[PDB]
Amino acid sequence: NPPPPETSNPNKPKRQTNQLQYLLRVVLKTLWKHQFAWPFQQPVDAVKLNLPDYYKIIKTPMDMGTIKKRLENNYYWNAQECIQDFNTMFTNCYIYNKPGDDIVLMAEALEKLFLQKINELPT
Numbered sequence: 261n262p263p264p265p266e267t268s269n270p271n272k273p274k275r276q277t278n279q280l281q282y283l284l285r286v287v288l289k290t291l292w293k294h295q296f297a298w299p300f301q302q303p304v305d306a307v308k309l310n311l312p313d314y315y316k317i318i319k320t321p322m323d324m325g326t327i328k329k330r331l332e333n334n335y336y337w338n339a340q341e342c343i344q345d346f347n348t349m350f351t352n353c354y355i356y357n358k359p360g361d362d363i364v365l366m367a368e369a370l371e372k373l374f375l376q377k378i379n380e381l382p383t
């Protein structure tokens with residue numbers, strides 16, 4: 261297991277926009293409670309999974325636990341950076357696995373909900 265993505269960076273400019281507040285309070289916390297959220301609530305544990313291949317394939321890992329900590333630390337400058345982290349998490353899953361795999365069906369259900377929730381954001 262490599263070190264998880266950084267969730268604090270002080271040479272980084274921080275913002276709390278209305279959109280970022282919404283991404284934490286509404287978007288992430290709704291996804292967090294989805295029945296299929298749990299594989300995505302923390303980094304892939306390759307050691308537990310006995311998947312020495314995973315981090316040899318996925319070079320920019322991302323998960324909702326990391327995103328949640330970033331949002332709580334005001335890590336992001338704008339909502340687009342946070343949405344990009346969500347999109348990296350989903351894309352990683354689609355890259356490493358194959359269409360129709362169980363974990364892909366879970367990611368697809370979360371992404372459907374994610375896209376529903378971010379279709380309209382605060383002003």
Ligand SMILES: Cc1ccc(-n2c(C)nnc2-c2ccc3c(c2)N(C2CC2)[C@H](C)C(=O)N3C)cc1
Binds near residue numbers: 300308356357362363
């Ligand atoms: C369907 C399913 C769902 C979760 C697990 N699992 C258990 C247990 N403990 N940790 C997990 C778990 C958590 C996240 C992922 C995966 C398994 N898969 C595996 C499965 C390919 C790959 C590595 C992937 O891209 N992601 C996002 C194992 C199977």
